[PDB]
Chains A and B, each alone.
Chain A
Amino acid sequence: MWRSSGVSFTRYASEMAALLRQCLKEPYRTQAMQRNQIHLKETVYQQGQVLTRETFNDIKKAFEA
């Protein structure tokens, strides 16, 4: 489904673990979504001369972009 949809197993596993974490109980779900926030800053280069810089706080937009 993923090698056909052009998707990696890591992406699938992460995006499904997100749902499993959403299916948690609130006391443990708090610590789970705590420990699994996202904050990244991608910076693309081409022989120097930065092409773009973009932030990421979500798994889906991080894998998409």
Chain B
Amino acid sequence: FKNQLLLTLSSPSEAIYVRTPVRSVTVPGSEGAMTMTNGHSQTVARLKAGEIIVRKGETGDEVERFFLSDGFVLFKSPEDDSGCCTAEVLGVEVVPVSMLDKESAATALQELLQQGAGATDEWTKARTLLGQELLSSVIRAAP
């Protein structure tokens, strides 16, 4: 077909992209953020949180931002006959940044800190810390 990047960004409730040709796609891996393009090696990575940023071939400069909670990314090499290299971004909850709020975010942060102040269980402490992480990411990512 073409030497583009075939992105499919999918959540369970809605598939935002299916075979969208793009140039570069940034994703917040568990180690650190990284940008996948055509020619990139086969790889699997776990994401933690933050703002996926898609950049179509027609756009180049224009972008598209999407906040992801958690999930996986699968980059697969290009078949010899297809001529195009594929990528699958699976997210348990993939929102755009336009639909986010910083006030309900801080309210949930406060309620989480209230619930976790009685730190007794490991899962409770871990959930408090991870909620702090994700809500700070939401606050920093929202407009």
Q: Place the interface of chain B in its size category.
A: 20 to 34
Which residue from B70, B100, B126, B129 sits with its C-beta under 8 Å from A23? B100
| Per-position 1/0 for A27-63, Cβ under 8 A of B | 0100000010000000000000000000000000000
| Per-position 1/0 for B120-143, Cβ under 8 A of A | 001100110111001100100000
User: Cα distance A25–B122 when bound, in Å?
Assistant: 31
| Per-position 1/0 for A12-27, Cβ under 8 A of B | 1111110111111100
Q: How far is the CB of B132 from the nearest CB of chain A, in Å?
A: 10
When C-beta atoms are compared, the residue in chain B nearest to A18 turns out to be B93
Q: Check A6 against B104 for contact (C-beta < 8 Å).
A: no
Q: Place the interface of chain A in its size category.
A: 20 to 34
Q: Check B130 against A23 for contact (C-beta < 8 Å).
A: no
Q: Check A16 against B134 for contact (C-beta < 8 Å).
A: yes
Given contacts A13-B71, A25-B100, contact A20 B123 (CB under 8 A): no
User: Cα distance A7–B126 when bound, in Å?
Assistant: 10
Chain B 57-91 interface residues, beta-carbon cutoff 8 Å to A: 67, 69-71
Q: Check B122 against A23 for contact (C-beta < 8 Å).
A: no
Q: Check A28 against B122 for contact (C-beta < 8 Å).
A: no
Q: Check A19 against B135 for contact (C-beta < 8 Å).
A: yes
Counting CB contacts under 8 A, is B112 at the interface?
yes
User: Cα distance A54–B19 when bound, in Å?
Assistant: 43
Q: Check A16 against B126 for contact (C-beta < 8 Å).
A: no
When C-beta atoms are compared, the residue in chain B nearest to A14 turns out to be B92
- What are 16 A-B pairs with beta-carbon distances under 8 A? A1-B130, A6-B122, A9-B70, A12-B127, A16-B49, A16-B70, A17-B69, A19-B108, A19-B134, A20-B69, A23-B104, A23-B108, A23-B135, A23-B138, A24-B95, A25-B101
Closest 8 CB pairs of A and B: A17-B93, A5-B122, A13-B70, A20-B69, A23-B105, A1-B126, A13-B92, A17-B69
